Write a protein that binds this ligand. Structure first.
Ligand SMILES: Cc1ncc(C[n+]2c([C@H](O)CF)sc(CCOP(=O)(O)OP(=O)(O)O)c2C)c(N)n1
Ligand SMILES: Cc1ncc(C[n+]2csc(CCOP(=O)(O)OP(=O)(O)O)c2C)c(N)n1
Ligand SMILES: Cc1ncc(C[n+]2csc(CCOP(=O)(O)OP(=O)(O)O)c2C)c(N)n1
Ligand SMILES: [Mg+2]
Ligand SMILES: [Mg+2]
Ligand SMILES: [Mg+2]
Ligand SMILES: [Mg+2]
Ligand SMILES: [Mg+2]
Ligand SMILES: [Mg+2]
Lengths: 541, 557, 557
């Protein structure tokens, strides 16, 4: 219904409601405060954060889970530029985010060029200069964020546009069918002829709408699977016997050996940016691309067969047309048997008593004890990230947020807060180093204020270890990587959250269990002995 | 055997002596048959490497026209036409042509020379960031900074130009990259994706809307004209019997000879059959259409249900917010829709009356010639075997107004950016694709002189092109609007020329119509010339104000 | 009485009916005497408002040449030439011309139409973000989005074009802004700033360097040619007696007639007097020079102390990192330096020998004509009362090589971007500034046909321009380098034309040289024509490889 609106902000809020938005994250200011004011009259919850960067991280968590964009709302100038890192992180990981940023009155733009600053790190960036287009622009931002391979979108809203009246109407919010039957038959024939097929899963294969169809295709075909880190949660060792690990980080993965051995590779939901094809595509295998978009071709990614459409309907049709389960070639069996032994060796069953400060593998064990299938895990960036990534095969979480191609620090706690708001009846564990922690730890006030049931673990080394380990390897000396200690227990408690500090190994497991039982935000500082990190870092590409 | 194989004898991995050789080998894999351009030092190794190829070098006389010629090739073949130019002004002379191709959806790849990578940042070259200059007028614009990426970038440029909604693509080639060695292979070209149709539930939703509509109409856009959609479109029209109108970009997607309920074109006039059926419609089904082709505020009354069928979701703007989107392979969607239509449309009395009115067309000795006399004489020489290309100016409006009585099956007229000078270069490009057929190009005297340097190219090629000039000694399309708004003229009058002698100085055949009676015999004589000819036709534009009141005037730039 | 007064009867605050009227009033305040361009609907109110002004409307036949003509006006008058075009292709047709003006430092303001503000974002217009397209090739590019800013933006565009190091500036004018009402006043134009000279301690530092140098030389750039610096430059040269060489952008900053130690120009050759003195120098003092004019890697051996004198600090690049910078008003700095020079330079034997060698110049009946024969005949008709303009191609190198024996005081040849087509439009612009003087323009057949449409403009204006074509039926400058590198040619040959008849079809006088003996009498006859004339001169380019070995070959685009 074309309505007359007293304020553009009111039409904005009504469009947000049509988009299923449940919360907005951000920080108000004069240029944008009419949108904040209009939200008082809506069902949408206003969540003030303490740094705009984290509004973008929280929004990304909401977008990743729900498939509908999370929303950040900030004022002009620094409110917008404080989003840029967060928006680039969302765009890189495929998380649907819409950021609405205030701007000066249109008449004053003559006397920050936010659109130019956001264009390199968004799918869509635009400023509303014609009030008659307000709802169209917002709708287009959600469509850009949510459709295809999702990503981030930025809309600049001049103060006079959202304050003044407008004429317009709200616009209501699967958009593709399955790949054609002839293409399904073509792929099914290739599968029937292949001796060493393998599935390479990318981002879109991990979307919730695809989980049942993916499982049916794997159950029917029993074809080995390897996954990019964007798709780290699509399949795991505990739910598929022919899982070959995540590829992209470690130089000794079954998935890579199977990709090298393959005579047929079927990439599902995958874009080359997720794992450089020069690393895995020999060119000797027939290459099938299945995604919501055409292939992003490059010299090491020129598919022989290209299917575009609804992934679930496509995989369901494909499963319906596979004649027999794969019988592994002897080479493929050995690769997977090799990986079983690799996993046993990584478990370190017999070298199981430890020393202090805590050995990383001891911390991983204690984390895997408290993270079960009802718990979400978020992972920051740092040396601990490599440890957790190495042991993803033995984590059994509801969901793991870990993929981080920009390698942005500070993501874990805001990701966890956003994920908790989606399913607040559940617990979230976030883990970071001490460097990443302090880049977003201001949101502990937000977490206390929300009573968010988040447990944050800090691997404490008083430095930037992941950088130090590389400096030591290249130069045998450290520079800019050491800093001072903090009383993290007292730090957490000054916010009104529960604090814990692990003063002994034996206290590790009971402390984490005690922290998990807190109904609300808790922080646990865990001193770590990274001496053995060179051992793990040598397992990297 | 796989496309990416490093042991394919048809696409071997080689240590190429010059990156230019790999570029040329890649062009061959893209099906390129000729390149249009002007050489210079930075790009001359690509010109040289083309000597060892089956690809023909066609030197033009101004780079803008290389882009125009390439667009004609792209539109007709569906594979990108290619322009090749040197650094600096060789590149910047392409920008209007690349914008025109991108706006019309014509696949064009421009390869432009650049200074050596080490010299890029020197102040001498600060006013020629060509990627920044081409980004606003292309789908794809990139510079090759790594020799290993040479084939990938050229391949990706063709893929951007040709796939999705086609458009123009620019590649900057630094001199040291094309002159120096490279290791790599050609990337074999891929076809269109095997794309799902729209979802079945959405298609049923639209079938039900069709069953309930009293005045449905199909609005065809650019992608409806692609050959992969031809059979499916024909079958849907035969099964549904729903009327159809086409934007100018939809080209010959449908013709009156095959479908009795074709209402003609939309995009310029406000009062023709297609416009009246769109105004009457309770359901508009757009196929392969984007608002770039025809501003929706001009045709969408907001009273009809709106369906969007295309390979891409809609970009919602004012007056184009579809109620249902059918996203996917157009042919697959149309085939599924045709299966779910239970009966042929019984036209409303008003709709039947609109189409009957279009069927009626009753088919002037003043000198200078009346526009209608010129149109009628052109319709005599332009038969189904002849391609027609049309420039921009008042004559374009006359020709568009009576396009229904031209029987050329190949017409290049669509020109949303309203670029002058396009007609002769479009005609040369079209002739090169089908040299066994005559092309007739038509312009005003303003547009003629913006690209007439290519008459030398036409003579050198022996192109069978007849160019007609409507001569008024001014920029009439601008004058009409100035007279209407201000009742006085500014900047629209210039002096006369002897266009017969002008054409002959190129070695083309020249003609000038000096009386009304001489029009038709002169056109026949110029048509019988086997090679380039130019005919000047003095025109009396007195009646033009009456035609422009039938136009969407706000669209004129 | 103050410049910003709201009660100035000479610049009243008004409720203007149309923003276009305020634009035109602002142009009058900037001293604009004519505008070059092509109208269209979006911009036609500015054309209309010019009817009520003393400013002359000059319609051109291709927008590129409006930019070229404007550059000639800017260079000669020091106040920006003005191009006026419509939206879309009217704007994008300017880009090469704006880049050429910016690179040469010619002040040019282009006013381009645009769609109404409300329509800017519609998809039809997505390929014409003109500010983004012009930003890489201008000093200043902006769109007026607030009517209250109309005069400010036009004023600021002239200030960007004219002040500092001059260049080109673009203003986008939305149709609704120029058609609708505005409240405001004209902004009176300001002069150059009253700028301090370089600091006294730095000037003494350079005076001491002069006192110690055995082979000092002045290298003059663009800003040395500005009239405000003329007396100061002359006085410094007379006091110091230091030799001087000029980039091509320095124009007529110094001539051999006034200063006996002028070594000629640098920028193309590697072996002329200026190049040898720069190679010999222990001290190089650059005045008004920027590396954009002449790549420092070509001339700076790194063995001399380097002084930078300009209104702006240096931008340090490879081979241009000055040891002392004298930043400030050039005239003020040169006047202070002259006061601190204690004696005239005694030239070194080598330096004196270099200059003696330049003084020697001993001042061929084959057909086609030898280039040297053509140069010598041109030197007969080009006297101090005649302006000479020169296009790009091999003939440019010949003319540059013997520029020392042309006695025209006004020569437009500098062309770092190497843009073809410049000469005829430059000549028309120059003639409009001083219509009492003859202009001779010279091009090849390639460059001729890129701008020859302006022969109609020349005939319509009755411009006293003689255009000479060196005719080889190819793109020779490219062919020479292809032959040298590859020993074969590609894309450089085209067909012949009857240029006499070509010119006559415009109503210009045409001539064709058919024998060596006929060259000089034909040139004299074409020179005696009072109005536009064209002379075709067949040229034998066999010897060109010998000339190009004297060039910095890497500079050719
Ligand atoms: C925003 C940003 N800046 C720089 C960096 C650089 N950096 C990392 C990159 O991934 C590697 F270049 S990780 C990291 C943090 C290390 O500090 P902690 O969090 O304490 O973890 P620890 O390894 O000690 O366990 C850094 C600094 C960053 N990621 N992100
Ligand atoms: C490159 C360019 N500049 C300006 C315009 C604006 N314009 C549109 S039609 C036209 C007149 C064309 O004159 P002509 O070719 O002689 O056609 P006529 O209307 O006189 O028949 C102009 C100048 C344009 N469309 N393209
Ligand atoms: C717009 C443009 N395109 C290409 C070039 C490269 N180029 C430099 S000189 C030249 C040849 C010019 O031919 P012509 O005008 O006939 O002069 P000639 O050398 O034959 O005497 C070319 C194509 C250029 N400088 N400018
Ligand atoms: Mg972007
Ligand atoms: Mg740390
Ligand atoms: Mg672009
Ligand atoms: Mg005309
Ligand atoms: Mg700029
Ligand atoms: Mg030539």
């Amino acid at each position: 219904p074309v309505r007359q609106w007293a304020h553009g902000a009111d039409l904005v809020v009504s469009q947000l409601e049509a988009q299923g938005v449940r919360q907005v994250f951000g920080i108000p200011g004069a240029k944008i405060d009419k949108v904040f004011d209009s939200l008082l009259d809506s069902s949408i919850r206003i969540i003030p954060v303490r740094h705009e960067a984290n509004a973008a991280f929280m929004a990304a968590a909401v977008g990743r889970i729900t498939g509908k964009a999370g929303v950040a709302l900030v004022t002009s100038g620094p409110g917008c530029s404080n989003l840029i890192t967060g928006m680039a992180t969302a765009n890189s990981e495929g998380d649907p985010v819409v950021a609405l940023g205030g701007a000066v009155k249109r008449a004053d733009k003559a006397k920050m060029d936010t659109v130019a600053m956001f264009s390199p790190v968004t799918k869509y960036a635009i400023e509303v200069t014609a009030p008659d287009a307000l709802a169209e622009v917002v709708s287009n931002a959600f469509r850009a964020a949510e459709q295809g391979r999702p990503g981030s979108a930025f809309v600049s809203l001049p103060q006079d546009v959202v304050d003044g009246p407008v004429s317009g109407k709200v616009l209501p919010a699967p958009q593709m069918g399955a790949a054609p039957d002839d293409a399904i038959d073509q792929v099914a024939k290739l599968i029937a002829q292949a001796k060493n097929p393998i599935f390479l899963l990318g981002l879109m294969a991990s979307q919730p709408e695809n989980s049942k169809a993916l499982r049916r295709l794997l159950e029917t075909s029993h074809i080995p699977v390897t996954s990019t880190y964007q798709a780290a949660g699509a399949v795991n060792q505990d739910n598929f016997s022919r899982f070959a690990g995540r590829v992209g980080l470690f130089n000794n993965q079954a998935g890579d050996r199977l990709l090298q051995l393959a005579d047929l590779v079927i990439c599902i939901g995958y874009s080359p940016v997720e794992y450089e094809p020069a690393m895995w595509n020999s060119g000797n295998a027939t290459l099938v691309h299945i995604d919501v978009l055409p292939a992003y071709e490059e010299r090491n990614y020129t598919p022989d067969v290209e299917l575009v459409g609804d992934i679930a309907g496509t995989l369901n049709k494909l499963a319906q047309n596979i004649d027999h389960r794969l019988v592994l070639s002897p080479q493929a069996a050995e690769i997977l048997r090799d990986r079983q032994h690799q996993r046993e060796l990584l478990d370190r069953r017999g070298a199981q008593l430890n020393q202090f400060a805590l050995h990383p593998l001891r911390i991983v064990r204690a984390m895997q004890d408290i993270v079960n299938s009802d718990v979400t895990l978020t992972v920051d960036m740092g040396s601990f990230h490599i440890w957790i990534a190495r042991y993803l095969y033995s984590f059994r979480a509801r969901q793991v947020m870990i993929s981080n191609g920009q390698q942005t620090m500070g993501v874990a706690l805001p990701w966890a807060i956003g994920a908790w708001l989606v399913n607040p009846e559940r617990k979230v564990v976030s883990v970071s180093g001490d460097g990443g922690f302090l880049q977003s730890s201001m949101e502990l006030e937000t977490a206390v204020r929300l009573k968010a049931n988040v447990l944050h673990l800090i691997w404490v080394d008083n430095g930037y270890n992941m950088v130090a380990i590389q400096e030591e390897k290249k130069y045998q000396r450290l520079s800019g990587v050491e800093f001072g200690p903090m009383d993290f227990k007292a730090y957490a408690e000054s916010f009104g959250a529960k604090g814990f500090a692990v003063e002994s190994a034996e206290a590790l497991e009971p402390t984490l269990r005690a922290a998990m039982d807190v109904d609300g935000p808790a922080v646990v500082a865990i001193p770590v002995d990274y001496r053995d990190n060179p051992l793990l870092m040598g397992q990297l590409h």
